[PDB]
Every structure is written in structure tokens, then in C-alpha cells.
């Protein structure tokens, strides 16, 4: 360590992380979407990796959860062309629409979080957050 | 007052979160604690609310928690009303040390003024909500 850390920094950061989760969840709930962070994560992986195998989803995170998502018409399982006993994962039209809607919710929550800052302030914040990682 | 939003901010914040999440898990594994953050959350609630019942704990965590509680019990970290054992108390304390250290290491590259500036900007964001 060079100097003791400011004792308010970890809590101030945690509060922002808390705000983002709380707001996203509240919006999802207000909007009647019945989605949890695990749901959002699963939809994102399936969209990002079309035809994802179940074990590969397992690695990046389940059979019960896919069953739920399939029943809600968000995910479709197709047989693996080489292995008829296993299934690969795809978003339905509805599941894709919901994934992209969830993404727009997340970006709006961030926009609303940051918009009270002036452009100079926002740029300073980017720099400081980046400084934490760059080093 | 609402300004246009810098498109680097959400990714910058997300990157910090993901870095910290990864580092905490790496340090828990480095110390062979065999815990994940949800496990520590259970231990922390049991520590803070010593004697609370299983149903109550389950609700606060928000079958599957009973599985985790049973796993923590099988490791003699939790005893039965729920209490941390001596081993559970020690491992919870060690996890907290790790959480604190990872955050110290996160903010280390910032000078005291940078640290104070970051506190202020994070506060300003929140206060306007």
C-alpha cells in the first residue's frame, strides 16, 4: 500500500453498483417481465453464441432454467445434428426481443445515473474508473 | 439538470465491477476457502443475525438455499435456529479480509485527491436520483 484508502470509496462504489441492480430489477418488475439476473445472463449468452451447447452454457454460468425459458417461449432447443440425444440452444423471436429490451433497460438506467453530471464531470469519472483498471 | 451521456461510462463502470468480481473469486480460491460470493453472503447473514431461522434466512437470500445451507453445514461452517461454528466464523472473517483487500488494491492506483474526487462524483450521481 502507498497510503490508506479513502474509507468512503468502497461504499460509494458499492452504492452505485446497488443502484444499478435495484433500478434494473425494478423496471423489469414494473414491466411484468418476470426476469432475474440469471435469466438476463442466459438470454445474453444464447444470443451471443447461437446454437450454444448446454454444457458450454453451464461453463459460462441449468437444465431446470432452460426448461422454464423454453416454456415461456424465450428459448428453443434443437437437436445437435451429430448427437441426437443432446440439444443446442437458440432464442426465439420473442426471446431475442426480450433480450434486446432488457439491454435497452440497462442502458437507460445508466444514462439516468450519469446524466446529472456535466460532460467535464463525466469524462473525469471515466478517467478515474479507467485508472483503477489500467493499473 | 441532464447532460448528454458519455458512451464510455457504462463500459468503464461494468469493467470495474467484472474486475472486482473476478479478483474476489481468485483470492477466495487462492486461500483454498472453497467459497463463492453467495456462500459468503449466507455466512454473513448468519453471523450478523445469529440464531435466525432457516425460513427467515431463505427469504432474505431472495429448496436451493436449503441445499447451500446444507452444504455449509456438511463443512461444519454452520450449526443448528442457525449459528456459525468456530470454523464458520473464521472463514467468514477471512473472506471479509479478502473483500476489503481487493477493493484496496482496486483503488491503489489513485492518489488521495483522485480518490476523493471519485467519491464525490459517485455521490453526485446517486444524489440526483
Amino acid at each position: 500500500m502507498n497510503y490508506p484508502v479513502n474509507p468512503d470509496l468502497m461504499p460509494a462504489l458499492m452504492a452505485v453498483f446497488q443502484h444499478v441492480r435495484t433500478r434494473i430489477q425494478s423496471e423489469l418488475d414494473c414491466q411484468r417481465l418476470d426476469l432475474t439476473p440469471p435469466d438476463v445472463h442466459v438470454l445474453k449468452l444464447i444470443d451471443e453464441q447461437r446454437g450454444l451447447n448446454l454444457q458450454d452454457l453451464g461453463r459460462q454460468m441449468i437444465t431446470r432454467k432452460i426448461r422454464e425459458l423454453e416454456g415461456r417461449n424465450l428459448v428453443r432447443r434443437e437437436r445437435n445434428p451429430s448427437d441426437q440425444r443432446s440439444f443446442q440452444l437458440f432464442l426465439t423471436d420473442e426471446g431475442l426481443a426480450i433480450h434486446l429490451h432488457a439491454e435497452l433497460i440497462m442502458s437507460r438506467v445508466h444514462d439516468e445515473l450519469f446524466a446529472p453530471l456535466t460532460p467535464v464531470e463525466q469524462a473525469t469519472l471515466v478517467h478515474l474508473l479507467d485508472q483503477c483498471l489500467a493499473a | 439538470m441532464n447532460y448528454p451521456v458519455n458512451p464510455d461510462l457504462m463500459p468503464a463502470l461494468m469493467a470495474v465491477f467484472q474486475h472486482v468480481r473476478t479478483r474476489i473469486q481468485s483470492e477466495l480460491d487462492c486461500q483454498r476457502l472453497d467459497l463463492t460470493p453467495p456462500d459468503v453472503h449466507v455466512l454473513k447473514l448468519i453471523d450478523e443475525q445469529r440464531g435466525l431461522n432457516l425460513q427467515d434466512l431463505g427469504r432474505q437470500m431472495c429448496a436451493l438455499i436449503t441445499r447451500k445451507i446444507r452444504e455449509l453445514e456438511g463443512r461444519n461452517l454452520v450449526r443448528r435456529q442457525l449459528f456459525l461454528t468456530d470454523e464458520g466464523l473464521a472463514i467468514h472473517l477471512h473472506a471479509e479480509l479478502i473483500m476489503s483487500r481487493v477493493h484496496d488494491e482496486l483503488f491503489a492506483p489513485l492518489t488521495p485527491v483522485e480518490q476523493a474526487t471519485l467519491v464525490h462524483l459517485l455521490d453526485q450521481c446517486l444524489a440526483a436520483q
Partner: peptide, 24 residues
Amino acid sequence: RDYTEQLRRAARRNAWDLYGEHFY
């Protein structure tokens, strides 16, 4: 016990939960 004071305290308390489950 002001707004951001309370949020900081609550968030610090929930740190394991927040890193354990998030949309990030």
C-alpha cells in the same frame, strides 16, 4: 442518515450479494 449515507451503508452491507448476483 441522509440519502446517499444510507445507500452507502446498505450497499456495503450487501457487497457479497451484489458481487454474487448482478446484471453485469
